[model samples]
Target chain A: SSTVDELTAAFTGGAATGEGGLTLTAPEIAENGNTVPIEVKAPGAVAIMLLAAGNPEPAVATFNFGPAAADQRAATRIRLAQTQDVIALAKMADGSVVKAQTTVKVTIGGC
Target chain B: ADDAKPRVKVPSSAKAGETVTVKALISHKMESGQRKDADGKLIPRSIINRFTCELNGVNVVDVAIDPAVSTNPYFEFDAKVDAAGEFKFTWYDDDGSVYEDVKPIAV
Candidate 1:
């Protein structure tokens, strides 16, 4: 059971924080639930993890960066089970975690 | 896993001290382990569990993928280039097989 808290704690060793310089870009209203674009941007982060609370499993995806990486940023498309808030969590090199969240209004009625 | 076809898109040329976007895609079904196959046998989950991108052996982008990722995993990220080198793209599968592709860029 990869819940939001469980996965983040396992990843960051309980060092995760909701107050980092991270920005999440997602549509407030998703035209289709099947596909929604999400982007995470942070500076000097070693990894970035995405989560969708309403999904059967809240953990959606995670991205890691190397030391030579200039600015930390990753983007990918994800499926939303329903209207939910998506979170972008980032891990700094010094073992600090920061994150942000946004709610996406998923509209149903698509085939 | 080796059969997975990996594709990458990067700028052919970029100036030093500039940041550029890199894109990657692969051909995969990404069986999530939750679904059963015909005859009710478990499909045995097989997915690209990890992905990494590097410039001249320096790490640029790395990601840990969950089974929830959609089919045909796609990634878009940014990297700052300091010199002329190749961007090596690597994908790790659940079956312990590794697939890789390299794209060269001029700075």
Candidate 2:
């Protein structure tokens, strides 16, 4: 019932997503689901979208890089409802999209 | 929330064409609207919905935040330094409150 597909489509604009060129760093096991730290990096990308597949609303955040950005990377903390895969999609400046995902095992649901 | 405050960490000086890291944090409750109160009533959601960073009036990063963000939201990113200028950081709250902070960087 999650809106991951819809969100992905909106981000990618119906473009196929490839693998690699995008990196997502998250803890393999999160002892506290309320504040799990995550990092995303994608060089030459114009924007990056993060999605928590198991959350009530899968959309987590979107980072849009601009001209003054030195590196297309960001780090932040997020809440996880349960053990689920966190997906990251990077839309490159050339209209190509790349994706990455990592499963985070949460001991307690945050939502 | 009135108690909300914005804080940032930026390099005081950088070489020309150098890249510097920036860290920003704002104190917020970030209620996700998925919680219930003692009376079994849903708690209304209140959160910082967006964040942006600019250097010398040039945009660096604009972030669209969701309720999934944790309390006291924190973000870390990088910006290029071409000249001396002030870095502006802003947070947009769901309750129509805007919090802003500025840091000057010398090159």
Candidate 3:
């Protein structure tokens, strides 16, 4: 596995799927690579991890939901070196991995 | 390391079922291992490894902070407010220190 796959595997185990369980909010065309707003939401997941393939690093952040958690959503601003895929991986309480992806197109001066 | 304080900002009140933003910050000098000291000795890496936020015992957002998160890391997320309860924020430092703060919300 490459950096992307390795991280996805390490964080959520080997099995991951592109399903409706996870949702990612990002701009289709990012005006600036310096700071892009990204959001990941999983309603029934115990944990969530954010990964961007284009950045210098594959792993962005990971989020976990506790028994007393009110919701399953995380949002943050990240740097995008270039145009690439942003993945949102979610792990269910039973250890299943759910994933979603969104592509971000950055300007030429970006990255 | 043991003197770090966890700071958090969450809506004091929200309409039932409304979603609100949660922001958290901890005072830390997240030193990356790559940096060398004045004497040319590599400084040990000291970073916050994990952070979690929960509402009324249910997890809202939990994160694994990497070296990418520089000094004084700040995180902002959203949580669906179903009912009024406690929002707990915890930060786990690499030095084995756990910083915690709690905020109450009313619906």
User: What CA RMSD would you report for each candidate?
Assistant: 2.8, 1.1, 4.3
Better of 1 and 2 by TM-score: 2
**How much of the true A–B contact set does each candidate keep?**
0.72, 0.87, 0.51
Measured with C-alpha atoms, the lDDT of residue B50 in candidate 2 is: 96
**Model 3 segments beyond 4 Å from truth?**
A29-34, A106-111, B1-7, B14-20, B27-46, B56-59, B69-72, B78-85, B95-97
Off by over 4 Å in 2: none
What would the per-residue lDDT of candidate 2 be over residues B46-99, giving only the tens digit for each residue? 999999999999999999999998999999999999999899999999999999
For candidate 1, give the lDDT: 0.82
Task: Go through the candidates in order and give each one's DockQ.
Answer: 0.58, 0.88, 0.37
Minimum summed lDDT over a 10-residue window in model 3 chain A is located at A62-71
lDDT of 3 at B73: 73
Error of 1 at A76 (Å): 1.0
Using lDDT, rank the candidates from best to worst: 2, 1, 3
Q: Is the docking of candidate 2 incorrect, acceptable, medium or high quality?
A: high
Better of 1 and 2 by lDDT: 2
Tens-digit lDDT string for candidate 1 (B17-53): 8888898998888877656657987777788898888
For model 2, how does the per-residue alpha-carbon lDDT over A1-111 read when each residue is reduced to its tens digit? Answer: 238988787777877789888999999999999999999999999999999998987788999998999999999999998999999999987877899999999998786
lDDT of 3 by residue, B5-73 (tens): 777887799999887888888888766564567899988878888888888887776788865454677
